[PDB]
Design a protein that fits this description.
The structure is a homotrimer.
Chain A lengths: L1 E7 L4 H10 L5 E9 L4 E10 L4 H12 L8 E6 L2 E4 L5 E2 L4
Antiparallel strand pairs in A: 1-3, 1-4, 2-3, 5-6
Helix pairs in contact in A: 1-2
Chain lengths: 97, 95, 94
């Protein structure tokens, strides 16, 4: 499993949420941040944790929905996640052997 | 080392802090976030040794759970190096 | 690639910002957080760099964020497998 982290223009949040929803990715954590790629501008961090095989689909959904083609569009990082635990059940999601 | 990241109900922060404190885990970073499994949630991050992960995860699950939808999730991410800014001492993951 | 994550005193942000700029590290994400060591207001700074730039980035942050007192914070180095430029769709793979 992987964490897909995108830092986007704040106005793109609804586009990104919709593009992820449409593909079955509803779960997300959103953080208000500041960034730059000269003052720090308001940006929005979107984080989703998905199965390895869903990464490329998630990355492409975010790129398509967050892009303008201008500087300041932001970046997406893919970080490994070793375990994902559902607090309500205690069930842990891992990659088989 | 691992970073244990939990996204919990904001009212559960003190429960989680206490459960971690009781087991010797005092250090933490807390961020105000929004989420859906967008409502206000709290992100708690602790960086621990590999052998402490299961204990930390179970302390958070026990103290943040309600059994209802919206309890949140815990992610375990690898940490390769941890540096103390005050001393410049670096802890490097076993190899 | 790696993500270098530093949790620093809020007053040190400008020092860190400048020390990274001077070395060619302009890209960064900043988050307002609360923290305590092993809750007070702190600042999280995140930079994603090539593997060979990590030690230089860590050095720049340590030098610019330190006071020598307790509460100076910590730096964590986390692996980044893919880095995507949203504007072009170009992906850098580790």
């Amino acid at each position: 499993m992987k964490m897909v982290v995108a830092v986007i223009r704040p106005e793109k949040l609804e586009c990104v949420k919709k593009a992820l929803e449409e593909r079955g990715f509803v779960g997300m954590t959103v953080t208000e941040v500041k960034g730059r790629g000269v003052d720090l501008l308001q940006k929005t961090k979107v984080e989703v944790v998905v199965s390895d095989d869903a990464v490329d689909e998630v990355v492409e959904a975010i790129v398509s929905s967050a892009r303008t083609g201008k500087f300041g569009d932001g970046r997406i990082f893919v970080i490994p996640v070793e375990k994902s635990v559902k607090i309500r059940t205690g069930d842990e999601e891992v990659a088989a052997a």
